[PDB]
């Protein structure tokens, strides 16, 4: 069901190396709905190539637009399992400290801060 379940560590590693080769300016992001989530829709895809200059605040706006949310639906984004310390950090910096050992940056969204 989840990304890590669907692909071998070997397969996730090789895919990241290919994004490096073909999309060198992009951060490879996995974005998944919280397994408990009732309110928000599922995304149309799992794997996102994010321009490495956007900050976390802009990435939240991007996903809220992708989900076509309205102004009073809540949305919380976890990175590498935990809350974002700041939305002003550039995703290139977030990648280097939060990336998985397979080389993806793993995010999860929910309508509650309590996931
Ligand atoms: O996956 C995405 N785009 C892939 C790009 C577009 C052209 C080459 O690959 N995006 C969704 C998340 O926001 C950034 C854009
Ligand atoms: Cl690129």
From Swiss-Prot:
UniProt-annotated location(s): Cytoplasmic vesicle, Autophagosome membrane; Endomembrane system; Mitochondrion membrane; Cytoplasm, Cytoskeleton
Protein name in the entry: Microtubule-associated protein 1 light chain 3 beta
Topological relation to the membrane, as annotated: Lipid-anchor
Taxonomic superkingdom: Eukaryota
Species the sequence originates in: Homo sapiens (Human)
UniProt GO MF annotations: ceramide binding; microtubule binding; phosphatidylethanolamine binding; ubiquitin protein ligase binding
Subunit-level organization: 3 different light chains, LC1 (a cleavage product of MAP1B), LC2 (a cleavage product of MAP1A) and LC3 (produced by one of the MAP1LC3 genes), can associate with the MAP1A or MAP1B heavy chains. Interacts at microtubules with CABP1 (via EF-hands 1 and 2) but not with calmodulin. Interacts with FYCO1 (via C-terminus). Interacts with TP53INP1 and TP53INP2. Interacts with TBC1D25. Directly interacts with SQSTM1; this interaction leads to MAP1LC3B recruitment to inclusion bodies containing polyubiquitinated protein aggregates and to inclusion body degradation by autophagy.
Task performed by this protein: Ubiquitin-like modifier involved in formation of autophagosomal vacuoles (autophagosomes). Plays a role in mitophagy which contributes to regulate mitochondrial quantity and quality by eliminating the mitochondria to a basal level to fulfill cellular energy requirements and preventing excess ROS production.
A Pfam family matched in the record: ATG8
This protein's UniProt keywords: Autophagy, Cytoplasm, Cytoplasmic vesicle, Cytoskeleton, Lipoprotein, Membrane, Microtubule, Mitochondrion, Phosphoprotein, Ubl conjugation, Ubl conjugation pathway
Substitution effect: residue 115 to A: Impaired localization to autophagosomes
GO biological process, one term: autophagosome assembly
UniProt entry tagged with the keyword Phosphoprotein: yes
Tissue expression per record: Most abundant in heart, brain, skeletal muscle and testis. Little expression observed in liver.
Reported modifications of this chain: The precursor molecule is cleaved by ATG4 (ATG4A, ATG4B, ATG4C or ATG4D) to expose the glycine at the C-terminus and form the cytosolic form, LC3-I. The processed form is then activated by APG7L/ATG7, transferred to ATG3 and conjugated to phosphatidylethanolamine (PE) phospholipid to form the membrane-bound form, LC3-II. During non-canonical autophagy, the processed form is conjugated to phosphatidylserine (PS) phospholipid. ATG4 proteins also mediate the delipidation of PE-conjugated forms. (Microbial infection) The Legionella effector RavZ is a deconjugating enzyme that hydrolyzes the amide bond between the C-terminal glycine residue and an adjacent aromatic residue in ATG8 proteins conjugated to phosphatidylethanolamine (PE), producing an ATG8 protein that is resistant to reconjugation by the host machinery due to the cleavage of the reactive C-terminal glycine. RavZ is also able to mediate delipidation of ATG8 proteins conjugated to phosphatidylserine (PS).
């Amino acid at each position: 069901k989840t990304f890590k379940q669907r692909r071998t560590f070997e397969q996730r590693v090789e895919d990241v190396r290919l994004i490096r080769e073909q999309h060198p300016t992009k951060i490879p992001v996995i974005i998944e709905r919280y397994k408990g989530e009732k309110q928000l829709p599922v995304l149309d895809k799992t794997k996102f190539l994010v321009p490495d200059h956007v900050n976390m605040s802009e990435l939240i706006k991007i996903i809220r637009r992708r989900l076509q949310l309205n102004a009073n639906q809540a949305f919380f984004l976890l990175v590498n399992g935990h809350s974002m310390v700041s939305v002003s950090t550039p995703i290139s910096e977030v990648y280097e400290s939060e990336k998985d050992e397979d080389g993806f940056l793993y995010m999860v969204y929910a309508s509650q801060e309590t996931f």
